[PDB]
Design a protein around this nucleic acid. Sequence first.
DNA 1: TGGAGAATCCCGGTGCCGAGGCCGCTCAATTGGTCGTAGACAGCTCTAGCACCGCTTAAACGCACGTACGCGCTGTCCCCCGCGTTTTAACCGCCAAGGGGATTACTCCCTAGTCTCCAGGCACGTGTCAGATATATACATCCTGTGC
DNA 2: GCACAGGATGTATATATCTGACACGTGCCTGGAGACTAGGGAGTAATCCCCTTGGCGGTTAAAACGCGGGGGACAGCGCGTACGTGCGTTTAAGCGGTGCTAGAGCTGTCTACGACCAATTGAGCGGCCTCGGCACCGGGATTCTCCA
Lengths: 93, 93, 289, 107, 95, 78, 83, 112, 105
Amino acid sequence: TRKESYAIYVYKVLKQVHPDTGISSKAMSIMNSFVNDVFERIAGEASRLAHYNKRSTITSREIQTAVRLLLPGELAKHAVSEGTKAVTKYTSA
Amino acid sequence: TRKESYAIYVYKVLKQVHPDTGISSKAMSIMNSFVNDVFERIAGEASRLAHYNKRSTITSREIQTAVRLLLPGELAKHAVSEGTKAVTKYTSA
Amino acid sequence: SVNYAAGLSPYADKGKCGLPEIFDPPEELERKVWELARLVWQSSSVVFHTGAGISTASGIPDFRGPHGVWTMEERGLAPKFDTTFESARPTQTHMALVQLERVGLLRFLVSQNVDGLHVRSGFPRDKLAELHGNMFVEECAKCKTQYVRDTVVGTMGLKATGRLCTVAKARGLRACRGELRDTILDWEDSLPDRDLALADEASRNADLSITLGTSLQIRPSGNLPLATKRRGGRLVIVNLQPTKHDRHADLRIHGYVDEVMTRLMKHLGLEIPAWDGPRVLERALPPLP
Amino acid sequence: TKQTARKSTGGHRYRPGTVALREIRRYQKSTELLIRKLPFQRLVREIAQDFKTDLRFQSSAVMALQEASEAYLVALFEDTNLAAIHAKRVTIMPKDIQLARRIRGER
Amino acid sequence: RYRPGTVALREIRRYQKSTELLIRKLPFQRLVREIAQDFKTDLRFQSSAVMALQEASEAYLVALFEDTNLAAIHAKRVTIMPKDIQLARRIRGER
Amino acid sequence: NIQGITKPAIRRLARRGGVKRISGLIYEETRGVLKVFLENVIRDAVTYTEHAKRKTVTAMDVVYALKRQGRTLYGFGG
Amino acid sequence: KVLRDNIQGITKPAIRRLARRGGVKRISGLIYEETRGVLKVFLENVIRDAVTYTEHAKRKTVTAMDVVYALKRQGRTLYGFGG
Amino acid sequence: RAKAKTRSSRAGLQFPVGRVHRLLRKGNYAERVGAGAPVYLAAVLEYLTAEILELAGNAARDNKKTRIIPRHLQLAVRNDEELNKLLGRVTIAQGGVLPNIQSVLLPKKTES
Amino acid sequence: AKTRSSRAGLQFPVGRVHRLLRKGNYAERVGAGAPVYLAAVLEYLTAEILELAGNAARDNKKTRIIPRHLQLAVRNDEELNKLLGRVTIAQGGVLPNIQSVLLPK
DNA sequence: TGGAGAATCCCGGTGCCGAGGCCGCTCAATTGGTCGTAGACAGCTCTAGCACCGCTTAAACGCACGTACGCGCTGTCCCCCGCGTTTTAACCGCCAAGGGGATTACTCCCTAGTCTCCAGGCACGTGTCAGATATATACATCCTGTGC
DNA sequence: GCACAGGATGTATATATCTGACACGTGCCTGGAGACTAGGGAGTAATCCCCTTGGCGGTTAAAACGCGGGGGACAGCGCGTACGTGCGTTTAAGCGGTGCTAGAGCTGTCTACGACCAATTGAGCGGCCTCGGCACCGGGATTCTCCA
Ligand SMILES: *C1O[C@@H]2[C@H](O)[C@@H](COP(=O)(O)OP(=O)(O)OC[C@H]3O[C@@H](n4cnc5c(N)ncnc54)[C@H](O)[C@@H]3O)O[C@@H]2S1
Ligand SMILES: [Zn+2]
């Protein structure tokens, strides 16, 4: 069966930030594993946050708190800011 | 309020193993927290194991594998033995 | 027959190597053993003390005597040995004591030797107090249990002998696993609490205790027969060398322990069993008529 | 010491080093927390001040913080002592703590 | 000839600048198969499996040796000894 | 307010650890290490509290902070 | 088929290369046996975990994901093999 | 309905089987939970707690006491290697530390 | 546009993120705003790491990115290192550095 | 200070396997609509966090003195390191067999979801017993006086 | 000087008194057990072929061994001073009272929202081909070692 990987969107980000650089298959696999791991960390922490307060829904608040608990200072601030911007631009339209 | 704890079962085990010995309140809280932590660890490992093999359920097999992965030394061997005896007796009933 | 002189520690303040091996005239020794027999045959609470002189007849050298290991290590360097604990043949005195216990006359026994020939002779372990210890015994570090083995553990200073405990707890739990440390006290080491307490109780209850094959220079071990006569009771110090408590001695001998004990049993009409291998026994055997 | 004695033959200012051994034996057999609760609680309040003002602390919360910090510092000092012994010394210095943390991964 | 010690730094720089797998592949695979014989008999490792095992082992050993060098240098030395490895493994909770 | 951890307190902590002598410059380093540890644990606990919309730092919040930092603490329930 | 004492395959120059990667300028002679033992212990741990995963999965081949999962469990997450 | 014999009694455990079943179901660990998982998990937890409690009671009896306290649990844990490994990251509150004095720290006897 | 990812200012797959969250056995319900946030955070972190790796590549006279570049980018940035302390990048190597005393004097 | 070299940075030529683009499409993302409930919001209260006081007093703080330790210098020796020749086995290139992983149907047994009944487990009330501190008492050993 | 005997130090045992936590008892209720059904998760058997194991053979890169010298590991010794210990003076921690109220927890009500479903379509994946980045190779110029 066909497998799922984040290769395409990693390519999109790479071209957006470095429009004249490539990436080797090994680096693509490393990035795929890293994205999987970071997503798993954030989602698991969000689920733990929800379970602690007896909630039953992993809402954006849970994700924001999880990303604040996981990433360090500057990384956490930038990630939370980008998440809020994304949600604002989404629900607005 | 309605609080949930394993205090009664822990005391039952203690009086089963040490016919004449008490256990302080703080000691009981420590034991209950230990049981909670071990339960969470085994359950999480069993869940990840069920997810890796693309199965959607948790069974005696997955709990056995989680116990093997987590507990070291003779601890794992004897825990597996007790779990197997328990499940075989239960199934026989 | 490994020596517990360098094994114990380099520090050795014995200060005793000139030991004139006084021997008694045969007639005087006969009279002294006669009076000791007269006293003991009626004395009810009788507890003995065997030192490192009984096994000298076996073959393992003593410590202070002219052939003492410490004495030789002091004056020059010439440690001579003949036998081994594994091949150590019990002396007739061990079987004599075993019989005395069997008939119930010997209330107790508190030895300070280390070969454990008393244990190997079948003396009820519940009746002895191996104060300094015993090679053939390793004690667990967790459950404080004992294991009378058949081959020397081979360690000194209360250290690991390379075996883990094998006593099984109930409820299918993990068996206790402790180092099974050795039992021989290094200089400046405490005594086994249970054995020492039992020895103290026995010695205090002893209205007549006789101390053999020991110079009694050593800690407590040589002090038990002081408290045997304090608060009443008579002390018989049967040894060749001048003991550290002759001035307090209520009796004395200058002769071979084997010979004096043989004369004692002859006067009593008593016989002696004839050694064995490691025929170890623990429960106190029933008293005999 | 009723009739009990070590293995032997028979027969003011403490030497600097023995009182510390007695102290070690004393504190390694006890369990009570080894920091004054009031100053430590004030410290926790001051530390949490920089994050969220007017923050009320449960008594059990401060106790849990104290237990955690005490255990962490005890372990750190154990490792620092091990490092100092490794360096052929007996007095733990700042470098021992720094190396212990560096190996521990925290530094 | 080179005075002793000078080429140690040269080797350090070379082997740090590079990124290959230092241990030989085939002996490492044989070691891994011998180890796995202990648990279950007649396994079949995917080549990627042994590659991952070798990468993990090399990274772990490099980190351990960096910690050990720090320990030895703290001990006023330049030669790393077994005691340094024991200390590094102890302060990190291993063993 | 940091100085509330008096030198005898750090000496007692070391004596529990196993130390026999303490260099005079240790105390400042120990205070700094304590400050760093408490800062991290308190930040995690305060984040947990702020999420739950509580003005009080519950004990379970500190327990969860410790569990997150891999220092699971028993005896306080959870 | 029954491999024996292949730990010797980790030779002195290989361990020396590994140490040089870590910034070491000089290596005592006794370091080599110690390093072989340490690597053996680490491999025992990882292979035990991987074999556990594989045997649970009803397979007979130690897929790379088995080793990656074992390393993730041991707090040594590895990137570049999936997961 | 017939007499309600709880699952634990049939299995023979002392811990609750139904309680752990509900914890697994509501814990969000899998879309469904087997019929044997709760029994095995309860048995494992009961065995682990039995081990800790038995060792703690051993420590208490060896300390001339009859009320297990956090100190007894700490001693029962850190003195057994497997449990120390399993409980490596815990800090049992009010447990103190094991009485460890490094040999180099001890004084040198054989004076006089 | 039609796709959630397009409606947001993202490039990561919002639909895939939501599907993984729903099927990942994390909670009974998953907020409709969660996937946007999680995808945005993943995109930001990938952008940061790739930016650093590309900078390293450019400083290394290479027109592409290779695991070594990712390793250098991760370890040479303190925040990412703390986030990525317990990771090892296969074929990544080790950051070049030597002790301050082993240098010649 | 200076001078010869091993190893290293760097310029030019370049061709293969891997990066990169094309494209059909088929399963997954998207739109719209329905329905139950999980959570938003508002209230009430009364638990417990907070603040303050006065008295005890355990512990903190300042200093003084000395020795035990840290530190540094100097002198073996011995134990690595560097280099050169032997040799040992990795490395690569290719080829074969077949196990075992991967996908596919049929299905059947097991677990989700309900509902009813009710004893197990909780909150509270109560009695009391283990543990802490203080008192007295019996016996070993150490210090000192008297007699041998 | 050693020993006998008494005074003193220090220890373990029997005992008393007290207190707050711990064990048992009780009613109350709701979460668990019994009986039931429906459908889909995953057994199980069959099939296919990808990839692992195994082998061989040649060149040959790295390991192995030996040998010499020189660097530093390690021991010892000597000097300064920093820490340990002790004592007396301070000070603020501990404890027990009250007195207040912020807000933690529970409840009640309702609606906004996620699950689900049907029907639609489009974009991300497998396989297709094309083009070039840099590993590799030739030599030219350069930087710390070592020697002098
Ligand atoms: C640690 O353990 C050791 C052990 O417990 C004893 C060993 O010496 P002791 O038994 O205390 O004294 P010891 O030197 O045996 O004094 C008895 C004297 O008897 C002499 N002796 C040899 N053979 C004898 C026979 N057959 N009959 C009488 N006396 C005999 C000995 O030579 C010695 O003088 O204490 C240490 S410390
Ligand atoms: Zn035992």
